[model samples]
Each structure stands twice: as structure tokens, then as C-alpha cells.
Target chain A: MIQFSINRTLFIHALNTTKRAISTKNAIPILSSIKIEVTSTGVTLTGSNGQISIENTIPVGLLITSPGAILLEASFFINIISSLPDISINVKEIEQHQVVLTSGKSEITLKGKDVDQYPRLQEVSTENPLILKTKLLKSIIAETAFAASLQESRPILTGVHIVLSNHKDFKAVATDSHRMSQRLITLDNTSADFMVVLPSKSLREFSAVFTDDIETVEVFFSPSQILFRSEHISFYTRLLEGNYPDTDRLLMTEFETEVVFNTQSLRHAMERAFLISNATQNGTVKLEITQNHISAHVNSPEVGKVNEDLDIVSQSGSDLTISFNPTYLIESLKAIKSETVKIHFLSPVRPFTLTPGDEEESFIQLITPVRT
Target chain B: IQFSINRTLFIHALNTTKRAISTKNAIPILSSIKIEVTSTGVTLTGSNGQISIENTIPVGLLITSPGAILLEASFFINIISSLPDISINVKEIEQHQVVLTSGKSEITLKGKDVDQYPRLQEVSTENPLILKTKLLKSIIAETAFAASLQESRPILTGVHIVLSNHKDFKAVATDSHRMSQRLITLDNTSADFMVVLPSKSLREFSAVFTDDIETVEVFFSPSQILFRSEHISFYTRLLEGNYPDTDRLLMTEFETEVVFNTQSLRHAMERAFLISNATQNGTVKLEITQNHISAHVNSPEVGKVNEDLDIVSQSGSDLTISFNPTYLIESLKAIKSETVKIHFLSPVRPFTLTPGDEEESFIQLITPVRT
Candidate 1:
């Protein structure tokens, strides 16, 4: 037998975090339930979806009756607890693995799964962890995560490759062969060395809630899993084993034409062209690059055409013409935090590199041209 | 060939009128929007299978290219709405063609034959009634939502409106299970007739410019009804067939009467009937004693909820009755009164709710669920 009383706000937060681990079309019966463990110290809520495990514990102040654990349906339990009117709720494990929750004059009874049937999560030792700021990691994730391929044909490309080296630059690179985004951050000192590929979907879940207020986070990993630990929460994600391709060689390609323009001006012109190109089904935007001017052109047989001559800050090298997918250009420019960006083009069939500013050469966005 | 004009006011009016036109699936030609430009003004009209709307722009508001044409609605509206931030110029190039140019971006789409479009029915100006604009709008909304949505029973899908000697006005609607009626007396008016107005048209008319019009002039012939304000004119097709006799059912001989705070009972029912089957009405049992009321529902699939509420006053006899929570909630919402008066005749007879202490009464009647 087990019993406890928890505040409604704390209970809501724990349930919200665990809900992400429950799958909508789940096949396994036990995975649909959340494990609740009560002890003298506090109560812990745990949930998992084969790939990721999320756990949150609310410590201190609570009335506990004996010490035991139980499993309850994640969605049904959340609905009943969130709708209760009182400030605090009393939960007791009743006969035959059923739980009764009482709040004010309302009482809800729900069937629960046996705690012994729940799967155990692996515990990785945090011997030597790479400590980094939460804000820096969040920025890196945003810039590179979107470039990953959503298709399962090439499973390795669905993860963002991260490298933490003793060398001055720590980097992350992601690509779907059509477009690629790479960002690097310089750390003061590197005490540990590890290379890991984290799924873009898992990174998105963590980055959405990662606040700038958190100063630091310690990251450690085992052979198949990686762990990120902070003061309040711990994130666990499975690692991809295949080696990420060598993207550094592609960055050194020589360019014949280079143009610099305000990032916002280029983005707005492409956005307008995207409206027509997307309707035409080709989704292509042509760039007329010259020494004095750069014009964006798009034509749909059904919806007419729009030609906008962008005001360039500066230009160099030679004249060229290239066409790219408008969505790739728009998303790449949106990720760069700069007033002006410079683009280097080689051949019409080759990929072009986008450098953020005139001074800093750390962040680069590359997009391959579509033969128009 | 073209005239430059500000895009701000044009877009605002287009968006406001578009709401009245678009529904899920409409006929191809009916979905096309009609744009007519005369030397003095520009008029835009959109019509669907259910409703038709015409909005006019005076010559002072815009500079136009003199022509009339029809264009496909979806793409034409989207192209115009998504143009760059600048003044827009519209040009007519002979028949079945037009161009919209703003800054460097220009869109050209083919137009349809304007003669092929259907025209709106003309309004008949016999026996007109002038009504307060705000009160007309409020009364329609108070009584319209209770009408039946099913097409099987066409007569119940319209709200029955009656006016006698132009001094007393009444509107009532019901779907057999639930009924809502509202009565408000007019000052210094005289007309005597009744019309069954379609709920869809009433909803569409009430949504149009609730703030500007102070009085609405209503003119009706045998088949059509027209409403004209100072700036806008609207016409709705009236429903034929005699409305059901609701006056006989409203008279009640009550055995038990219970009065409770309207908001308190609504809130308690909402909490107790959380997991309800929407199709098969959720039943919440109400036990009325002398001073308190208790609402209980056993949704065995999910769980059970029981709520206790305090009653303001009671008389006649103690009674326990069950009602569909949805009908009970809608009835209380339409009452618009703080304290609700519930008069129960028996366990199975229909119960009536009235606003206490009034010469003219607005009563909402709900049929009790037989357990």
C-alpha cells in the first residue's frame, strides 16, 4: 500500500514533462504508462518511448504511506489531476493495482499497471563530462538542426554530428545533401573529447525549453547513449553509430563570384519569389549575379513572373547565374544572426557557401544549386 | 489603363465580406467573386450556395479602371492579399482579363464572363417595419442557436419570429428536445405579421457591422425579406410552412418550483459532466431539497462526479429530476439573468425556467430525461 499528497502545480509540471515520452501510436502496452515511485525523500515520475527517457522528481514536503511504486496510464492520469479544483491532491494506491485520487469533494479512481512490469533505464557514469553553457548549445542546435533529412532512407543524415575536441573550435554540422548548415563555438578549455550524433527530433525537444538563465550543463555519454545533466532536469538520447561524412573538404572549394548583401533584404525578395515558385511546382528562384547588381527572378506559367533587383552592398570576382530552392535560401538566411552576409559561388552545378559577416568566418550555410 | 490606390482599406473590406462567402464545398461558378467598376463607384460581390453579399465603394474612396469582370476567388484573393508593401494598381485589359501591379510584382489572371453569373433577388418594399438595430441583432443571436441543424426537419431549422400590432415582439426556436423563447416590447410602433427566418441568414445578417447601424428598416413580401441600414442592405429567403404551435406547450401546471443562482448551477454541471457522450446526451441528475441542490453523473467508462450546490429558494414540493446537461447549459446561457427560476411539473414532464418578477416573461423550456 502507498499514499501521498502533492501540490497541484508541481504535479502538473511533472505530468507535462513525462507526456513527451509517451507515443501516440504505441504498440507496447507497458510503455503507455508512467512509473511513479515514492520514498521518504520525494516522488519521482518516469516515462520512456524506446528511444528517449524523461524523468522529473518533486522533492520535499509530502505525506507518504509506506514506500512503494506503481504504474498508471499517462494521459488519463494527467487529465484527472489537471482538472481538480483544490490546491493539493491526495493519491493512494488501492487494492489490485488501482489508484484513487481525491481533491476537495471529487474523487477519481483509475486502473494501474504493475510496477514490476516496467522496463529499467540504463544508468551511465558521469566520470568525465564536457561542461558547456546552455545558451551556446541552444544556439548551435537551432542553426544546424533544420538541415537534417526527414526521410529514413539515409538514417545517419537524420542526426546532427557534434564534435568536442581539444582544438580551439567545437562544431556541429547537419546536411540533407541539398542544404547544409554548420556552426562552431570556441570554448576556453576542452577537458574531454567525444564525438556523438544526436537525433534532430530529440534536440528540438530540449532546445525548445532550454532557457538563457541556465548558466551551464554537463554532457556525458556511454557507447550507445548520451546524457545531458542540469540543475533541474536531465536529458537522455540514443546515439547513432555510423560515421558522419567529411564535410570540411567541401568548405574549401574555390569561388569565382562573391557578393555581399544585407541579410534581411535578400530574405524578403526570396520570400516574395517563393509565393510564385511554390505555385508553379518547380519551387526555384534564379539569381542574376553581376559586378554592379544582383537580381532575383521567378516565373510561373500560370501566375506571371516577378523580377526584383536587390541592392548589393558590394561585389567581386566574376558574373554568374545560379538557381536554388527558395525555401533553402530563406531558412539559411533566417538562421544567421548578422546584418550583412556574403555568398561565394563556384559553378552553376556546385554548392555555394554563405559566410555570416565580413569579420567572423565561424558560421557557414551551404546550398546546392538546382540545374534550371 | 490603371490607377494607383492605397491597399489598406481595400484589403480590410475584402476580408470582412469574404467571411460571408466561403464555405467548405461550393459550386464552381458560384465560388467566383464578382467585381464591378462604374464611373461613380466600385462594387464587390461574393455569393455561395447559401448566402450572397454585395459591398460598394464610393468614388471618393478609390480610383478605378472602368470595367466589370468576374475572377476565380481562391487564387485571386491570395495574390492580391500577399502583394508587397506598396500602393496597388488595378488595370482592365479588354474582356476576360485584368492585371494587378504593385511595385515590381504584377499578377495577371483571366476573368470569366460576367453575364453568366446569377443575380440577387430584388427586395419587395411592402409593409415595412423599423426596428432598433442593437436589439434586433441581440435577439436573433439569443434565439438562433437553438434551431435544429438537421436538414431532415426543415421547418425547425428556422427561428419563428412574430410581431403583433407592432407593440409586442416575440422570437422562439426549438429542436424538439430544447426550446428558447425571448419577448421584448417595442415603443411607439404598429405592424402585425409573423415570418419564419432562416437561422443561417439571421446569423449572417447579425454578424454584419454590429456597431454602425442604429435602426434597421425591414421590408417583406410573401417570399423574401429585405433589411436595409443607412449604408448596407441585406436580403434573406424566408422559410415557408406553418411553424409548430409552441404557445400551448408553454402553459404549465407545476407541482414543484426551485430557484437557484444561474451561474452556480451552470458551473456545477460543467464540472460533474466532464466525460460525456456528445451524441447520446449526457444525463446529470439533480436532487432539489428545501435549501440545497446536488448534481450527480456516473460516466462508468471514465469515472463518476458528484457536485453539491446551494439553492436560493424553493416551494411547492421536493423533487428529483434528470436532464441532458447540454440542454440545461444552453437554456441557462440564453436566459441572461442572474437568478434562474425552474418549475418542475413532475418527474417526466417538461420543466420550464422563467425570469422572476416580470410582466412580460422570457421562458426557456427543456424536456427532462426519462430515467
Candidate 2:
């Protein structure tokens, strides 16, 4: 029987970090197992597929004098353990391939996966990792990762390109074919300059590791793997193989017309326009802006038409006409819920820039217009 | 001309009462219209299907003194005037049928469904009547619904008819072969007795009523047609063709081992069924024991499913019965809730049950067993 006792509170917090490491597919029998090794360093947990492995060691969170090793089915054990309250999960090694989990005065013998066959992580030490606030990195990922193309034609587009510069600034960029979002941020400390494209799913998983109480998040990277460390949670993800295309030329240096409007008002007006624009024949909404007035004009052959005008509280520009997929515009506005939004147009023909404020460098969202 | 207002509150209230006058295949022209007449007595509204009429509306909610009659479609007018906080004025006598709606701002809509609409309700003011609250409608619908067929071959199984005599304080309804539900009460206050029912149709229209009536009087012509009343809401439905002779088959008195353990029985049965197939295998058995009670179910290929469950703190003499999964649970539990229920029943031959209590003649569910 496999029985182990863990401090319920401590184990839950530690599991929250380690659970992400577990492989979703156990294609190779050993890969689906979560390997738990207790050593003097701490009880280190590793979950892996052959292509990727995530390992986390808690130096203080665990107190283990006698060392041990075992592999448990990752998802099954995690579900059972989390539903249970905070208590030392007493694990007993009964046979060569079985463990017993006991807590809350009840005992369940878990038939564990073979520890001998379980894949192990290629171990790395905490030697000079990149340091930054995990929250800042999380925001960068959230802003830019959503725009990436979901299709595998350009596999690298399904990731956020994290470029760490020698000056300690982090630049993240993601793009599908129709739209692109990029964020440039500055960290207080310093790190080696390098670039890697982490899978969007992994970035999402790592983003969840952030908490309000965390102060400094330590990041370490090899050519193939990236690690993010917070107080109690540690997240690791494998880097994608292909190189990302350089997309700096897409940002226009000069604009013909720039109009500023309240985010909430624009969001509402386009949403009403969405009621008309969403139908197949009419997926585009015409944005007409004069000196002080802006209106949305939408027309469809079969399903009637709508024209909505919203007063521009402030503006200074030549009158302009632009047609865009209302869905794309609305999504970008929701993501950049700034007090005020600036819409920059190089010309009616060139790619327009949408950013939170007037700043061209920070948290930028770009959308290409359909030939309407 | 257009502006905006709160569409939320308007849709909420209109959707609530819209149940009584549901969408049906009308004469197409009048189908779009909910002909509203406002006068001193009450505001009368009507929805008709040429052959059948559904009419009765809230007079107090509509207050127009001179009694105005406007010919227009109910649906488009509903959409146009919906957002306004007050009674919207819709004038259509001119070429453009205009609906002027105003809240904090205003929106005037121009549309037309104007052909002539017809008057539908023809019930005499002197037709003997009964009053029923939405609660009675709910109770009867819930109880009698169990006997109706979901997908039986003969369409008759889909209906449960009510048979009430002019003087008898009782109601009886049944689907053929499997089972029937009969409710008996001490109060016989209606002059007209009725039988025959279209069970599904009545249940569909009766769903949207608010349940706050003292007592509902049911009026009918012996199952051929019936009208139920509340203070403000009234509904009528055509009765169904010959229901089975459920009265002859019903046992006046029968003896069998009866037991009660609302909690454990519901628990063990429900858990085992969880792992059972959704469509194919839903049956489970109850084994009542004097000391240790449980249920047993297994589907050879999928898995042997078991539930170690606790029952409500009650038990009866040891007995065992195998039952239809849906029918058994319907009679045993008021609801599938976190807490296990307490259930009391006779042997597998018949099931007499309802939401909670068997008293009050309010809610009764008769179930057929899995043989």
C-alpha cells in the first residue's frame, strides 16, 4: 500500500504549481506518470511527455529526511488529493507497482504506474536565471498571445515570442495572418539577451501561476526549456522549435489621421453595429469620422441595414473612412480597456495601428482591414 | 428616429406572461397580433387559431380610460414598444403604422402587418366557471405528466384526460396499459363536470403562470372541453378522445410489504445509475435489509457500478423491489438534491407518489414498474 502524510495546506499550494507539469497524454506508458522523488534538497516532482518535462523542487515547502521515489497516475491522484482537505497524505508502498493513499481517517490503495519506466526530466540547476515580476510577463502574454494564428501552417504563430534584450526590456509578439499584437515592457533588473517562442498554451498555463503576494519572479531558460518561479508556484514550458519572423516593419511611423475616443463608448457602438455586421454577407462596418462626429454604417443585401452615430467627445484629424471586421475591432477594444483609445491610420490602404494610448511601444494591437 | 432605453426589464416581464398565449399557426395575419382592447371593465387580449381561441388578459396592468382599439401585429409592436417604461402609444390608422416608444429618450418605429384581424373568443359570460391559481395548474400538470407516454407507439399514451362529475369532489386521469393518476378532494364547488384532455397541449400553455390563487375552479363539458380560472388569468383547452378505463382497473384496497427509507434508497439507486448507460441501461435494484441495506447493478462490459451511500434517518421493514429507473425515482424524491431522500412505497406492482407528501391531493405521481 502506498501511504504518505503531507501538510494539507502546504501540499495543496505545492500541487497547484506542480500539477501543470503533468502530461495530458500518456502515449508512452511512463510519460503519463508523475514522478515524485524525495531527497535532502526537498520533495521534487516531475511530470513529462518525452518531448517536454516539467520539474519543480520546493526547498522549504517539504521536509523529508529519508529519501524515496515513486510514480503516480498524474490526473487521477491530483483530483483525489485536491478534493481532500489539508492533511498529511499518508502513502504506503505495498507492492512493486501499487501505493496506498490515506487521509481523513480513510484509506484508498492506489495502483500506481511503474516508477522504473517513468520518464525523468533532464535536470537543470538554478544557475543564474532571468529575474522579473511574473505579473508583468503574464500581462504581456495575455495581450499578445490571443492574436496568434491557430492554424499550424505557421507553427510559430501559435506562441508568444519572448525576446529578452541586454537592456533588460521584454518584448512579446504574436500574430495570426489577419491581426497581430505586440507588447514591449521594461523590467527593473537585468538578464542575458535571447529570444524564444513559448507555446501559447504554455504561456497561458504559466500566466495562471501568478498571485498578488508574489514579489519577484525568477525566470531561467535553456535553448529548449523556460522556467518561471514565484513564491510557492513554479512553472516550466518547452520552447517551440521554429524561428519567428521579424515583424517590426508592420508598425507605421507616420499616420495621416489619428482620432481618440472613449473606450466604453466605442465598445458599445460597435457592439450594436455587430448585431448588423455579424451576418455573413455584411461582416464589415464602415467607420466614418469627420472633425467631431463618428458613425458606424452597416448594410446587407438580404437582412436590412443600420447606421449608428456616436458623438466624438474630442478629436483633431482630417475626415477619414475605414472599413473593418467589427469582430476584430471589438476584440481588440475589450483587450485594451484603457480609459481612452487611439486609432492610427497610415492611409485608408495601409495597416492601421490600435494601441491603448498614444504610446507606440507598449501593449500594441494591430489589425489588417478586409478589402471592403 | 431612434434612441435607446432599457430592453432588459421589458423582455423579462413580457416573456413571463407570453407563455399563456404561445406561438401557434394562426390565420397568418392575426398570428402576429395580440389584439389588445382596453376599457372600463378590463383590458381584453386575444390569440386565436381560427378553430381555437386563447383569450384573457390583465385589465389592471393596462389603464386607458376611453377604451382604445388598435389593429396591429402583436410581435413587431411588442419589439418596438418593449424598451419603454410606460404604456407606449401605437397608432396605425394612417399609411405608416407608427409605434412611438419613449423612456428617457424616444424611438419611433414604422412598420406594417395591417390586414384586418379577427375577434376570437366566443365564450358566453354566463358559462358556469371555476377559479384556479397557477399553483393548481402546476400541481396537476406535474402529477398527471408521469402517466403520459414519451415515445410509445400509440399516440393515446401521450394524453392523460381528466374526468370530474358535476357533484363529485375528485379528478381522474390515465394513460393506457401502464398506469394512471387520480386525485380526490373534499371540495366539490363547480357546476360543470368535464373529461377528455390533450395532456401535452395543456401542460405546454400552463407553464408560464404565477402561482398565487386561493382555489381554482375547473369548468368543463365532461372532458370534451374545460376552462380553469384565477382572479386575473383564465385558460381553456379542448379535451382529448377516450382515455382508458382506469377506474375499473384501480385497486380500491391492496396489501403488500411497505417500507420507508427516503435517503438510502434514493442514494444507492442514483449512484449506481450514474455509471449506467444514459439511454440503454437505467434500471437498478433496491435490496432492503433489516441491518445493512444496499443496491446492486452491473453492465457487464462497461463496469460494475456501486454506491456506498447514506439514507435519511428512517427505515422500514425489510423488502425488495426492482423498478423502472425514471418512474421509481420520480415517485421517491421531490428533487435530486445533495441530501438523499426518504421514500415509502408498495411492492413493484404499482407506484403512488408525488413531489413530497401523498396528502393534499395536490401532487400525485403514479408510476409503472420495469417488469
TM-score of chain B taken alone, candidate 2: 0.69
Query: Which residues of candidate 2, in runs, are more than 4 Å off?
Result: A4-128, A131-134, A199-240, A357-361, B1-6, B13-134, B137-141, B144-150, B154-161, B167-188, B191-207, B210-268, B277-283, B297-317, B323-359, B362-371
**On residues A1-372, what C-alpha lDDT tens digit does candidate 1 reach at each position?**
778998898889778877787776677778988889888777888888877877666676467766778998787678768877678998988777877777776565666767999988888897878887887888888899999888888888999988877755688999998899898777787566678888888888777544467788888889888888776566788888898888777674688988988998788778877877888775798998876877888877765566777778889999999998999999999987789998999988899989887546488889999998
Clash pairs, candidate 1, are none
For residues B1-371, write the lDDT of model 1, one tens digit per residue. 34555677667666656655674545667767788777766667776655566776666256645777887666667767766656887887755667777765665666777887888787765657888888887777678888989978888998998887667788999899888788878776767778888899898887875667689888776677777776456667788889999988794689888887887677666665554432267788888777766777776545556666777788988789998888877777766677888899887989998865443467778888888
Q: Write the per-residue lDDT of candidate 2 for residues B1-371, one digit (tens) a residue.
A: 11122344334434433443446544554444343434422233334431233334443133343322323334443544433244444333334333344332222333333235454344444445444454446445544555456435333533443325644444444444334354554353445444544555456445544554355444444323434444233444454455555556554443332333545445444544543433374555556665445555554423333333343333555656555555555544543233322343555545443333344443333443454
Deviation from native of the Cα of residue A199 in model 1, angstroms: 3.0
Candidate 2's displacement at residue A135, Å, is: 3.5
Fnat for each model: 0.24, 0.00
lDDT of 2 by residue, A96-190 (tens): 55555555433344555556676445554568877776566666777877787778777888887889787587788888867888888776767
- lDDT of model 1 at residue B136? 83
Model 2 compared with the native: what TM-score? Answer: 0.69
